[PDB]
Amino acid sequence: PPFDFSTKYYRQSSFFGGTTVLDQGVGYAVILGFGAFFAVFTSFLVWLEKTGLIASVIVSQWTWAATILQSSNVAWQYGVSGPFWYASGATIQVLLFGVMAIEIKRKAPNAHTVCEIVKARWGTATHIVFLVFCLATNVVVTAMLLLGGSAVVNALTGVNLYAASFLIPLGVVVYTLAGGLKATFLASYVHSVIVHVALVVFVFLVYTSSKELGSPSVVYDRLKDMVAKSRSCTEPLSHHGQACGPVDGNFRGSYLTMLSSGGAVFGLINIVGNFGTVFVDNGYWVSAIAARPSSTHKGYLLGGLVWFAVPFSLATSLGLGALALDLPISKDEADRGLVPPATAIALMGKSGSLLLLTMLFMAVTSAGSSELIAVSSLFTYDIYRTYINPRATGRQILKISRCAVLGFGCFMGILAVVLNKAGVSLGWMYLAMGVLIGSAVIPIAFMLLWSKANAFGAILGATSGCVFGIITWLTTAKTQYGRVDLDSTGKNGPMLAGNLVAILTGGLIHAVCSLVRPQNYDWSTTREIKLREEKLRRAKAWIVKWGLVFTILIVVIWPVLSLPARVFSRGYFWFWAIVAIAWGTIGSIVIIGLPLV
């Protein structure tokens, strides 16, 4: 027993190895009745219904299953810089959302999907090409929240892993088929309130009230004893990946430092992934066509500032508390998204597990309902109406919309079962998003903004970038290691190479083939899809001016100013923790109380 506070674990190769905290009945109830319960609740909310609400709406559509599970994964590694580099992809989102919402009103105000603009601007061959890159994004993104949720449910309640994978989408389908087609303005408020209450409780548990970890001076003392050079991590005391001894790639092998190379590489990958999530996902566009930016453009900045605090504070609390407690978490287990449940069980046994399950399944249901209504609209407006029957009455569009939801929900369950059998995990899929669909980001931006891009260059760049990125991503893994499998492929180097190659070459071919043969476009035909510009011109100016300042302040200046601190001292870590606590508390207070006022 090297440590006095972790004697009960002595050596253990894993945290979850039997004797589940809860029983299978709770797991089945959670994975079955959540959709019906909130459907009834939303029906009651609608019945009673008949810059603060907009912020609550923005926050509710940006919290996914990765915001909870993945942000603590890169905190168990790399120490202090992981949560920061994960949360830094928030100021870009508000700028992109504002620009997209402003520019859709002034060039295509009567559209439903992004692929309806591709057919209008360019021809038909490019419509099919980008219709495949849009469905792949939905397939990849939906498969990410079906792996983490199933893993967490199986870890906590002991329910069969292959039964949860198929039964999780059915609850979301039931929720979406009933009220939930954006429902009303109150469901977002309820979701945000629950999420922020859970966040506040978890943050305040580990730094103020817990008996095991009740001070920022205990976490500091325990984090610097794990990376001691006198520590032995041989076979009887530690296993291969188990967070023992100095951290490789960190200055002096410390968890308390901003000088981490792995964290910086992860942030570089995360930027490309966030770029790929905004332009290629049809749910973002669906949310951007229903916005009123000429009068309510100021809520997006508040929404982004409030959303910044969730992946930062939660990962700082639940991620650094697992290292300080000396839990036998393995690398494969931490990859799957099982870091927060372990800390919740260790610190708040049998009561924090239910709270974390509720917080996770709120996001799972909210995000899966949006993914289901990004493909039913795609199918019903870009395939059925355009090619199979181009003369359709309303009663015949509502049947197709309802059938597409069932079809996608039933297909994704089988896909999730297959992926769980094959051993794929969240975190491997999170990093690989930009390699696959990163080549169609710049063509779509050119379609929305640039007036010289043409059809042929778009197809050429989109098709070439994916192939080149995949080739580079596989060849780097083959060259730098001895094999091509799920272990060597999911590393920072190959993933960074694939991401950069995929994103960069798709915007260079399109920008070269268009400067030779420009297609001067006035967006006349996109405005005919089946004052006022002064306000839209003053909203865009405000968004551009006030969105860049915070992006520069957060993504650039703040990490630069923290490098001279080298290894954090007791007094700088106090400030670092107090910043997170204050940010989380103030954001929760603003988003819970102000909309009432």
Ligand X SMILES: CC(C)CCC[C@@H](C)[C@H]1CC[C@H]2[C@@H]3CC=C4C[C@@H](OC(=O)CCC(=O)O)CC[C@]4(C)[C@H]3CC[C@]12C
Ligand Y SMILES: CCCCCCCCCCCCCC
Residues in contact with ligand Y by the rule CB under 6 A: 259, 560
Choose, by CB under 6 A, the member of 32, 128, 139, 264 that binds ligand R16: 264
Q: How many CB atoms lie within 10 A of CB 41?
A: 15
Choice between 2 and 249, CB closer to ligand R16: 249
Q: What is the DSSP letter of 78?
A: S
CB of 204 to ligand X, least distance (A): 30
- Joined together, the tokens standing for residue 108 give 């295509």
**Residue 321 CA from chain centroid, whole number:** 22
Which DSSP helix (H) or strand (E) runs through 267? helix 261-279
Would you give the binding string for ligand X spanning residues 212-251, x where CB under 6 A is met?
A: ----------------------------------------
Choice between 70 and 257, CB closer to ligand Y: 257
CB of 258 to ligand R16, least distance (A): 7
Angle (nearest 5°) at CA 343 between 340 and 349: 115
| Closest residue to bound ligand R16 by CB | 259
Please tell me whether residue 362 binds ligand X under the rule CB under 6 A. no
Please tell me whether residue 560 binds ligand X under the rule CB under 6 A. yes
Would you give the binding string for ligand R16 spanning residues 220-259, x where CB under 6 A is met?
A: -------------------------------xx------x
Taking the C-alpha atoms of residue 536 and residue 457, their distance in angstroms, rounded to an integer, is 31
Chain position carrying tokens 């603009």: 117
Would you give the binding string for ligand X spanning residues 474-493, x where CB under 6 A is met?
A: --x---x----------xxx
Choice between 158 and 262, CB closer to ligand X: 262
CB of 492 to ligand R16, least distance (A): 12
Choose, by CB under 6 A, the member of 265, 305, 400, 536 that binds ligand X: 265
Distances (CA, A) of 105 to 55, 58, 119: 20, 19, 18
Chain position carrying tokens 């088929």: 177
Choose the one of ligand R16, ligand X, ligand Y, none that binds residue 252, judging by a C-beta under 5 to 8 angstroms depending on kind. Answer: ligand R16
- Percentages helix, strand, coil for the chain (3-state, rounded to 5) are 70, 0, 25
H-state helical runs in 124-258 = 125-157, 161-177, 187-204, 216-223
Choice between 257 and 370, CB closer to ligand R16: 257
Choice between 217 and 480, CB closer to ligand X: 480
Torsion sign across C-alpha atoms 327, 257, 208, 218 = positive
CB of 251 to ligand R16, least distance (A): 4
Choose, by CB under 6 A, the member of 261, 296, 463, 551 that binds ligand R16: 261
Please tell me whether residue 497 binds ligand X under the rule CB under 6 A. yes
| Closest residue to bound ligand Y by CB | 560
Distances (CA, A) of 203 to 48, 146, 255, 580: 34, 26, 19, 9
Choice between 444 and 496, CB closer to ligand X: 496
Chain position carrying tokens 């999530």: 277
- What single letter denotes the amino acid at residue 221? D
Taking the C-alpha atoms of residue 396 and residue 417, their distance in angstroms, rounded to an integer, is 33
Q: How many CB atoms lie within 10 A of CB 219?
A: 24
CB of 143 to ligand X, least distance (A): 25
Choice between 362 and 501, CB closer to ligand X: 501
Q: Mind giving me the DSSP string for 82-98? A: HHHHHHTTTHHHHHHHH
Choose the one of ligand Y, ligand R16, ligand X, none that binds residue 476, judging by a C-beta under 5 to 8 angstroms depending on kind. Answer: ligand X
Which DSSP helix (H) or strand (E) runs through 274? helix 261-279
Choice between 282 and 476, CB closer to ligand X: 476
CB of 263 to ligand Y, least distance (A): 12
CB of 283 to ligand X, least distance (A): 25
Angle (nearest 5°) at CA 395 between 391 and 399: 100
CB of 460 to ligand R16, least distance (A): 34
Q: How many residues does the chain have?
A: 597
**Beta bridge mates, 257:** 567
Choice between 51 and 261, CB closer to ligand R16: 261
Choose, by CB under 6 A, the member of 92, 178, 237, 268 that binds ligand X: 268
Chain position carrying tokens 């459907």: 39
Q: How many CB atoms lie within 10 A of CB 64?
A: 22
Size of interface with ligand X, in residues (CB under 6 A): 22
CB of 559 to ligand Y, least distance (A): 8
Size of interface with ligand R16, in residues (CB under 6 A): 8
CB of 563 to ligand Y, least distance (A): 6
Please tell me whether residue 564 binds ligand X under the rule CB under 6 A. yes
**Residue 594 CA from chain centroid, whole number:** 26
CB of 329 to ligand X, least distance (A): 21
Choose, by CB under 6 A, the member of 214, 241, 493, 559 that binds ligand R16: 559
- Name where the chain breaks: residue before each gap, C-N > 2.5 Å: 10, 50, 530
- What single letter denotes the amino acid at residue 174? V
Taking the C-alpha atoms of residue 574 and residue 184, their distance in angstroms, rounded to an integer, is 42
Choice between 88 and 287, CB closer to ligand R16: 88
Q: Quick one: which of 243, 214, 260 has its CA closest to 567?
A: 260
Taking the C-alpha atoms of residue 364 and residue 159, their distance in angstroms, rounded to an integer, is 18
- Binding positions for ligand X, rule: CB under 6 A: 261, 264-265, 267-268, 271, 476, 480, 491-493, 496-497, 500-501, 504-505, 508, 555, 560, 563-564
- Binding positions for ligand R16, rule: CB under 6 A: 251-252, 259-261, 264, 559-560
